[PDB]
Structure 1
Amino acid sequence: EMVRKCDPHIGLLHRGTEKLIEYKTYLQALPYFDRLDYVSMMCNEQAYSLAVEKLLNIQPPPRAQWIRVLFGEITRLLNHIMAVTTHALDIGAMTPFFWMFEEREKMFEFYERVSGARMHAAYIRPGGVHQDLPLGLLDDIYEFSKNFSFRIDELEEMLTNNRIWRNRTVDIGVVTAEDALNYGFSGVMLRGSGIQWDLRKTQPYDVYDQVEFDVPIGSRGDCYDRYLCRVEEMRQSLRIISQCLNKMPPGEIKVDDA
Structure 2
Amino acid sequence: KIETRTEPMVINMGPHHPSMHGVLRLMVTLDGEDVIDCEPVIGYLHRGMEKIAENRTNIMFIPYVSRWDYAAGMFNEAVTVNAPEKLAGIPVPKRASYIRVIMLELNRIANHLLWLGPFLADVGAQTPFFYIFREREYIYDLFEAATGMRFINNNYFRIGGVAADLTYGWVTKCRDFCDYFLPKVDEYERLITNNPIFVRRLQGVGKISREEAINWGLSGPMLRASGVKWDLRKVDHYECYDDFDWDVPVATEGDCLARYIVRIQEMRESVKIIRQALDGLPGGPYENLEAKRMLEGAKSEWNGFDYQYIGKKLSPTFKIPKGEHYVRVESGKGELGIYLIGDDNVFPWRWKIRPPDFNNLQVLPQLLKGMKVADIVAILGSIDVIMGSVDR
Partner Cα distance (1:168, 1:13) in 2: 30
Over residues 201-249 of structure 1, what are the superposed CA-to-partner deviations in whole Å (9 max), with x where a residue is unaligned? 1112111110110111111100000111001111011111110111111
Partner Cα distance (1:196, 1:142) in 2: 29
Asked if 1:51 corresponds to 2:75, the answer is no
SS of residue paired to 1:48 = helix
Equivalent residue runs for 1:100-249 within 5 Å? 100-120=132-152, 121-249=154-282
Over residues 88-109 of structure 1, what are the superposed CA-to-partner deviations in whole Å (9 max), with x where a residue is unaligned? 2223421112121111001101
Partner Cα distance (1:159, 1:109) in 2: 29
Partner Cα distance (2:193, 2:160) in 1: 43
SS of residue paired to 1:82 = helix
> Is contact 2:227–2:251 with CA below 8 Å preserved after alignment?
yes
Deviation at 1:173, TM superposition (A): 1.0
Greater share of helix: 1
Asked if 1:77 corresponds to 2:133, the answer is no
Partner Cα distance (2:211, 2:183) in 1: 37
Superposition misfits of 4+ residues, deviation over 6 angstroms: none
Deviation at 1:70, TM superposition (A): 0.7
Equivalent residue runs for 1:12-23 within 5 Å? 12-23=44-55
Give the greater-gyration-radius structure (CA).
2
Partner Cα distance (2:64, 2:148) in 1: 18
> Is contact 2:244–2:273 with CA below 8 Å preserved after alignment?
yes
Greater share of strand: 2
- Once the two structures are overlaid, the 10-residue window that deviates more, 63-72 or 180-189, is 180-189
SS of residue paired to 2:35 = coil
Asked if 1:3 corresponds to 2:35, the answer is yes
Aligned match of 1:255: 311
Partner Cα distance (1:257, 1:150) in 2: 40
Say how many residue pairs are matched. 258
Over residues 33-53 of structure 1, what are the superposed CA-to-partner deviations in whole Å (9 max), with x where a residue is unaligned? 101100010111111111111
Give the counterpart letter for 1:128 in structure 2. Answer: G
CA RMSD of aligned residues (A): 1.3
Over residues 74-129 of structure 1, what are the superposed CA-to-partner deviations in whole Å (9 max), with x where a residue is unaligned? 01101111112211222342111212111100110111111121121111112211
State percent identity of aligned pairs: 41
Partner Cα distance (2:133, 2:267) in 1: 15
Partner Cα distance (2:166, 2:210) in 1: 42
Partner Cα distance (1:156, 1:237) in 2: 15
> Is contact 2:222–2:259 with CA below 8 Å preserved after alignment?
yes
| TM-score, length-scaled by structure 1 | 0.96
> Is contact 2:188–2:264 with CA below 8 Å preserved after alignment?
no
SS of residue paired to 1:151 = helix
Give the counterpart letter for 2:308 in structure 1. Answer: E
Aligned match of 1:27: 59
SS of residue paired to 1:7 = strand
- Once the two structures are overlaid, the 10-residue window that deviates more, 181-190 or 224-233, is 181-190
Partner Cα distance (1:142, 1:59) in 2: 29
Give the alignment partner of residue 40 of structure 1, picking from 61, 72, 76.
72
| TM-score, length-scaled by structure 2 | 0.64
Aligned match of 2:287: none
Over residues 48-71 of structure 1, what are the superposed CA-to-partner deviations in whole Å (9 max), with x where a residue is unaligned? 111111112111111000000111
Specify every segment of 5 or more residues in structure 2 that has no aligned partner in the other structure, as ranges. 1-31, 284-306, 315-392
Partner Cα distance (1:215, 1:190) in 2: 12
Give the counterpart letter for 2:184 in structure 1. Answer: R
Over residues 117-144 of structure 1, what are the superposed CA-to-partner deviations in whole Å (9 max), with x where a residue is unaligned? 1121111112211021111110011111
